[PDB]
Structures are given as structure tokens and as C-alpha cells.
């Protein structure tokens, strides 16, 4: 790869950075839940935080994870301040959406194989 | 099935039809070979088109012109 990285070098400046801001989210989930005046339980927020980090764990290449670091840090800029007026934080939860079937016999009665 | 959306809405519909209103025209005649059809007036209406009238005395309304043209 004839290309210079962004921040990390190989996997060890990387994996300590994804652990790093996890604590910043972890003290943020109880902090905002009384701030944005919404009403769920706070443990659901801590489950959804680790939901997001664990899903993308299939990467074996640097500067992509580092690209997600810049994406992950920019999320906190609106978050610590008040730039998401009670909707964008609720946008994380697919709440009023009807459930996808995800089962073969269930797909077969409704839909032209979507 | 669709008949419920207009209940108390009276179904504003057209009255006249141009499906067949060509047929009440006094079908024209010349006794020549080829005629212009700048019908409706010049520089408006349908463009100029030339028709052969030799065969069951007619033209075929020129498509564009619409008026029944014959001899």
C-alpha cells in the first residue's frame, strides 16, 4: 500500500482508540437521558452503544477503523452539546417500524421475494 | 370496488365526446389529384400534408386534419 495513514500505524494505535471513546459514551448515556427529556431505561442505551461497536468487528485492515474513528468522534460533537433536537437521538431506535419477517415461510406469503 | 370514493361528490364528468364527431361533417370533395390541408386556418392547426384521393373516393381525414376529406 503506497498510501500514508491518517492517525494509526498498525492495529495498536487503532484498537486502543476504539476502547478510548467508549468510556466517553458510557458516561454520556446516563447524562443525556435526563437532558433530552425522553423516557426509556438507561441500560437500553448502554446495550445500544456496545451494539454499534461489536457489529463492525470484521475488519483486518487499518485506516478504515481510523476512518470510523473520525466518524465516531464527530458523533460526540452534537451529542455533548445540544444540536439534535429530540429526534436524531430517537432515530437510532427503529421503534415504530414494522418488523421484518426474516423467515422463509414468512416471506413466501407476502412479497415477490423482497 | 372503486365506487366509494365519490359518495356525495357527484362525479364531475365530461358531456360531449370527440370519439365520433368527425362523422357529422359534410365530407369535402374536389375532383383533383392532390390537395393541401392547412385546415383550421393558416399558420395554426395541423401542418401541410398532401393526400392522394384515388380509391374509394376518400382521403382518410389526413390523421392531422381530422375532417373527412374525399371526392
Amino acid at each position: 500500500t503506497s498510501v500514508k495513514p491518517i492517525f494509526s500505524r498498525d492495529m495498536n494505535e487503532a484498537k486502543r482508540r476504539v476502547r478510548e471513546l467508549y468510556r466517553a459514551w458510557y458516561r454520556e448515556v446516563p447524562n443525556t437521558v435526563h437532558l433530552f427529556q425522553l423516557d426509556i431505561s438507561v441500560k437500553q442505551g448502554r446495550d445500544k452503544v456496545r451494539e454499534m461497536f461489536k457489529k463492525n468487528a470484521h475488519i483486518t485492515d487499518p485506516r478504515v477503523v481510523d476512518l470510523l474513528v473520525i466518524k465516531g468522534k464527530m458523533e460526540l460533537e452534537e451529542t455533548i452539546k445540544v444540536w439534535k433536537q429530540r429526534t436524531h437521538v430517537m432515530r437510532f431506535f427503529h421503534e415504530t417500524e414494522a418488523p421484518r419477517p426474516k423467515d422463509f415461510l414468512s416471506k413466501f406469503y407476502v412479497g415477490h421475494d423482497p | 370496488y372503486r365506487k366509494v370514493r365519490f359518495v356525495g361528490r357527484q362525479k364531475e364528468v365530461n358531456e360531449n365526446f370527440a370519439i365520433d364527431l368527425i362523422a357529422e361533417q359534410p365530407v369535402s370533395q374536389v375532383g383533383s389529384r392532390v390537395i393541401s390541408c392547412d385546415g383550421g386556418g393558416g399558420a395554426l392547426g395541423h401542418p401541410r400534408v398532401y393526400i392522394n384521393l384515388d380509391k374509394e373516393t376518400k382521403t382518410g381525414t389526413c390523421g392531422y386534419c381530422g375532417l373527412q376529406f374525399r371526392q
Binding site: 498510501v3 500514508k4 491518517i6 485506516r63 478504515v64 476512518l67 473520525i70 464527530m74 460533537e77 452534537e78 444540536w83 439534535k84 429526534t87 436524531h88 430517537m90 432515530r91 421503534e95 415504530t96 417500524e97 | -
Partner: protein
């Protein structure tokens, strides 16, 4: 040839053939292609190692002022093996001359930004991040301008379709204005317009 044909001139085609020639002569480190447009424009193709100093060379001189940064744009080109194309456009105040800087790059490879060199690139440089993901280097404040807060698309590239996925609606289920998958009332009927038979002789491709 006639009236209603643009009368070209040769004086500006001469000096812009003259001026830009000894630019590559005095920096044969970064310049890789120079070309003269047939209507008095100039391109200086630059590998982005010299993204800062060549601007810094055009930042000041006694024979080239060029201190009016007008236009930072961004053009994507798929099927190039390095997609994107950052293109500047700068103006000489004392000389009335236009010249552009074409610098290619790729997605993940960053670019040393022009933050100390120019301070008109404060909102222009962030825009390419929001629309493409081209992470410029060492900018003091990278943020989100001209897009909404929840997008993940960087829409101005070609794989992002015309509508998004995020057609928004309201319900009184509790209070919220909730997102939903996108649903249109009409296809946006896509036509087919490219007529055959090759109206242009001059730009004829190498026939392979």
C-alpha cells in the same frame, strides 16, 4: 469564417502558452502535465505531494501575485483507478488571468490541506468531507455543513441513488417524527437519449 461564430484571438493564446511554460521549468518536482486550453485557460496537473508549496509559490512572487482564491470544487470520476479529482481555481489580481490546479487523489489517502496557505478554504474544505469523505489533513475544525445530522452516505458520488433511503413522515403514535424506508408515488421515469452516429470528428477516440 462568418458572423455568428466566436472570434478567437491569439494574443492571450500566446502569453498563456508563454507564461505557463517556465512554471514546469522551475519546479520539475511536482508538475506532471501542463496544457493550454483553446480559449485561454491553463491546467497544471500536480501530484498531491506538492499540494502546499506550489500554492505557496503562487501565494507570492513578483511576476505572479495570485492571491484571490475563488473556487474549490470536487469532481468524481469513476473508472479511473483513482476516483476523485480536487480542482482549484485561483485569480491573479494585478494581471487578470485565470488558472486552475488539477490534483487527483483517492479516497483513503489524505491530502495536506491549504489551511495556512489560504483562509478562504475554511468552509470549502469541509464540504468535500461531508460530500465525499476526502479527509483533508490538519484542519482545525472538521464538522458537518449542508447535510442533515443522520446521513451516512456522502451523497455527491455516483453510487448514492437519486432519492436516499430516508423518506420522513409524522405519526401521532407518541410525538415523534420518525424515519422510514423510502416510498415514491412515481418512478422518476428514466429516458434514453444518446443518439448514435458520432457528431464530433476532433475528439475521436483511439480506435484500438
Amino acid at each position: 469564417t462568418r458572423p455568428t461564430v466566436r472570434p478567437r484571438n491569439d494574443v492571450a493564446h500566446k502569453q498563456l502558452s508563454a507564461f505557463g511554460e517556465y512554471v514546469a521549468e522551475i519546479l520539475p518536482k511536482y508538475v506532471q502535465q501542463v496544457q493550454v486550453s483553446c480559449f485561454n485557460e491553463l491546467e497544471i496537473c500536480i501530484h498531491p505531494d506538492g499540494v502546499i508549496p506550489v500554492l505557496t509559490f503562487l501565494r507570492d512572487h513578483s511576476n505572479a501575485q495570485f492571491k484571490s482564491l475563488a473556487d474549490l470544487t470536487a469532481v468524481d470520476i469513476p473508472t479511473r483507478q483513482n476516483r476523485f479529482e480536487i480542482v482549484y481555481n485561483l485569480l491573479s489580481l494585478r494581471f487578470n488571468s485565470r488558472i486552475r490546479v488539477k490534483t487527483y487523489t483517492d479516497e483513503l489517502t489524505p491530502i495536506e490541506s491549504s489551511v495556512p496557505v489560504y483562509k478562504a478554504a475554511n468552509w470549502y474544505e469541509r464540504e468535500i468531507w461531508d460530500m465525499f469523505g476526502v479527509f483533508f489533513a490538519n484542519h482545525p475544525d472538521l464538522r458537518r455543513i449542508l447535510t442533515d445530522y443522520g446521513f451516512e452516505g456522502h451523497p455527491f458520488r455516483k453510487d448514492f441513488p437519486l432519492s436516499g433511503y430516508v423518506e420522513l413522515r409524522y405519526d401521532d403514535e407518541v410525538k415523534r417524527v420518525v424515519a422510514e424506508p423510502v416510498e415514491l408515488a412515481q418512478e422518476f421515469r428514466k429516458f434514453d437519449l444518446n443518439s448514435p452516429w458520432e457528431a464530433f470528428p476532433a475528439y475521436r477516440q483511439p480506435p484500438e
